[PDB]
Design a protein around this ligand. Structure first.
Ligand SMILES: [Ca+2]
Length: 223
């Protein structure tokens, strides 16, 4: 997260870190046994880390639980990032508490102008690299598709939305992928892609979760 602020320990209790020896992506807890993340974060050997603030220090509220199954969206396209969404089932149910909590799925989509909270342990620099230990947070509005497309020349699909600031300075970044975009109390986005970080006319691109709620619910019900 570039241009954000330190969230405060466990103030984003649905945020998870995906760990394969090191943090590599974020995710969001959606019930005690399931996490949603980005398909482009797919790999084997995932340990889900819940209750994290400082990812390099055991602070006392963590739960580390191995993935038992990962399900990349049936239509995920790695070249375009269309349908950049994945479900991860935990081997055992997380113990839910004030620091480890699910985030509600939307029943309807969000609109341009609505403010969202984006969070993660990704790079905090727009030029060069610095990776934080504690969770970072950013408030950012959803942009209209037309404004985003015209400003950026990005090729996106109806399964994506742009959020952020066309002037630059505030954005998600490498290492935030898979993590949450929460708007009006609902998980509306997943950190998906962009070009650089926090550059002028290059806002963040997010998977549009409202298009996937039926797939999420049916997949969890059957698995
Ligand atoms: Ca920790």
């Amino acid at each position: 997260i570039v241009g954000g602020y330190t969230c405060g320990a466990n103030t984003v209790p649905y945020q998870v870190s995906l760990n394969s020896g090191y943090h590599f992506c974020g995710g969001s807890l959606i019930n005690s046994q399931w996490v949603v993340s980005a398909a482009h974060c797919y790999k084997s050997g995932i340990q889900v880390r819940l209750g994290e603030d400082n990812i390099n220090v055991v602070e006392g509220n963590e739960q580390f639980i191995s993935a038992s199954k990962s399900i990349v969206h049936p239509s995920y396209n790695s070249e375009t990032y269309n349908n950049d969404i994945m479900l991860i089932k935990l081997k055992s149910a997380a113990s839910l508490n004030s620091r480890v909590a699910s985030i509600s799925l939307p029943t309807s989509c969000a609109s341009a102008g609505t403010q969202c909270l984006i969070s993660g342990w990704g790079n905090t620099k727009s030029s060069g690299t610095s990776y934080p230990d504690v969770l970072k947070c950013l408030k950012a509005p959803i942009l209209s598709d037309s404004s985003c497309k015209s400003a950026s020349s990005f090729i996106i699909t109806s399964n994506m939305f742009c959020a952020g600031y066309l002037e630059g300075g505030k954005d998600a970044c490498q290492g935030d992928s898979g993590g949450p975009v929460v708007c009006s109390g609902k998980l509306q986005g997943i950190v998906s892609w962009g070009s650089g970080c926090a550059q002028k006319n290059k806002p963040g691109i997010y998977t549009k979760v409202c298009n996937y709620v039926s797939w999420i619910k049916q997949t969890i019900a059957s698995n």
